[PDB]
Paper text:
The [name] protein is one of the key components of a ten-protein complex and is essential to initiate NER. In particular, the [name] protein verifies the presence of damage to the DNA and thereby allows DNA repair to proceed. We solved the crystal structure of the [name] protein from [name], which shares high sequence identity to its eukaryotic homologs, and show that it contains two RecA-like helicase domains.
The first three domains together with α-helix 22 from domain 4 form a donut-shaped structure containing a hole with a diameter of approximately 13 Å. The interface between domains 1 and 4 forms the composite ATP binding site. Domain 2 displays an exclusively α-helical architecture consisting of six α-helices and one 310 helix that surround the central 4Fe4S cluster. Our structure may therefore reflect a ground state of [name] prior to nucleotide and/or DNA binding that underlines the conformational flexibility necessary to translate chemical energy into motion. The postulated DNA route passes by another highly conserved surface feature in [name], a narrow pocket that is formed by the strictly conserved Arg88 and Tyr166 on one side and Tyr185 on the other side, and is located in the wall of the central hole, directly adjacent to the 4Fe4S cluster.
Residue numbers in the entry: 23 to 509, 515 to 615
Amino acid sequence: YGVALESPTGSGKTIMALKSALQYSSERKLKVLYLVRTNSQEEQVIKELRSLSSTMKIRAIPMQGRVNMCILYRMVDDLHEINAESLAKFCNMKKREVMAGNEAACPYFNFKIRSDETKRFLFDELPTAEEFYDYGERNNVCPYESMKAALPDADIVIAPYAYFLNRSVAEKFLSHWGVSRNQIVIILDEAHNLPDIGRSIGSFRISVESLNRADREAQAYGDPELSQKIHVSDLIEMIRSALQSMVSERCGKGDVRIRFQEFMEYMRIMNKRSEREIRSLLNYLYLFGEYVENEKEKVGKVPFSYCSSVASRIIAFSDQDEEKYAAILSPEDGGYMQAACLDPSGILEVLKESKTIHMSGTLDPFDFYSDITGFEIPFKKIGEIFPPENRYIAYYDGVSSKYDTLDEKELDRMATVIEDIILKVKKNTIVYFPSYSLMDRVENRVSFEHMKEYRGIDQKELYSMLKKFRRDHGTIFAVSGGRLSEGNELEMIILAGLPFPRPDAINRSLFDYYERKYGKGWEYSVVYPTAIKIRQEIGRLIRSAEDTGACVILDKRAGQFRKFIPDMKKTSDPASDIYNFFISAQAR
Ligand code: SF4
Ligand SMILES: [Ca+2]
């Protein structure tokens, strides 16, 4: 039901896909779906599809949910949480008012949704979703409805994972396409993220600021009596103080694992009631949400209720999840409790109901991906092989890690070794750190003109640095997991510390899960993901068979990763060996 392929990185990954997935494609009616995580990857796919469009016929359109593609809803209202359901009701009512006679109701709903001009743009130019949104904006035509209008005559579709893996959304999506999950083919772009996408989509949380929000909604819409003497506002106060007492009492320096029944226990003891009562009041809150939703709708607002969406998430929290999820409490962002999905096999399972094709270029040992993802498929290493002498991977002793976030002494060795390498190699380097504290500690010990990448991010200032990166000079600092992971220019990578997952309660839980299941919690929850994080930087450094680069790791326990990286070396003088490597590269 699936195939996993590995291509050496860059400009090819998605061309190879249709070149390895014209198999089936259209001889058995099938539709080609392209799932993508970030919008940055989306366009790296679409740019490829655009190139091959002149080769032979392909009719593609990007597809995304109203949550992204509805223009109106951000002007009419602006909520801090939202969902596809509420936007459905909202929009359907607007379309009613337009079709009834009030075109102003929603000025983006008109003939242009079905016009040749619009459909020409979608197929002949094949924009990204962000690009087709902009088109729609300037042309006063709804992007979403346009996509859905163009969909039934589309052979190929490029959508986010979070769109399709939303069960209720996928059903409407396919009901309009005409295709069924039998008649589909799904290409999983950068499928090395599949495990993480599952755990992400699967998880949910109830945060204090979310209760705060429902509290204001409660006051807005009557704050009626749920029980005789307990109002909506009172119930919310009960639920927030359960959470706050839990965060106060249960956790210190950060996250903590708790048991799901604990919240209800805290709920029961504090307020002197049993489950029946608390379950009921929680239900009566969801019902109030339903009232709020109806009341917002009949006015013309987006019918989204914080009390409705909170009610369900608490019910969901307290009810299921004991085996495949973990109950994490957290002090962050006022506090929240979370259902951390530890095993994404059950979320991703819906995919093997269609034919899947797992594209990456970075999932070295497949067993881990198969065991984690729960995908029992063949694995082929389809990719014309780049020579190993064109690459240089090595790890270094000096900066010996007895602790993972301590020792000023061994942090000086981190600064010096870096400074020796960059000043001597003199090439376009980016130094990934495992955290912001180590990067900030190193930067003030270091004394060379570099380029920061601190929290805040914002899309505009990311390019301002990227402009000066490609053009002149060289060095850039970044935290590994950050947004420099989304991209000639590059040449050397200095992993200033091996990018392990943080001492989370979640990562602790994941270890336990893959300890109780395979007796290898370390290999499954720490190493394999870290190896795949590394390989990715190595992969984004060398994309061509004629491109060159180096990648050092400053870590004493980096030796582990030889069986994941079969051409890694070890160094005691990395500065000189990398320089000696680059002299050998220049030669040719
Ligand atoms: S037609 Fe209007 S209400 Fe519907 S998704 Fe488009 S902008 Fe939103
Ligand atoms: Ca509802």
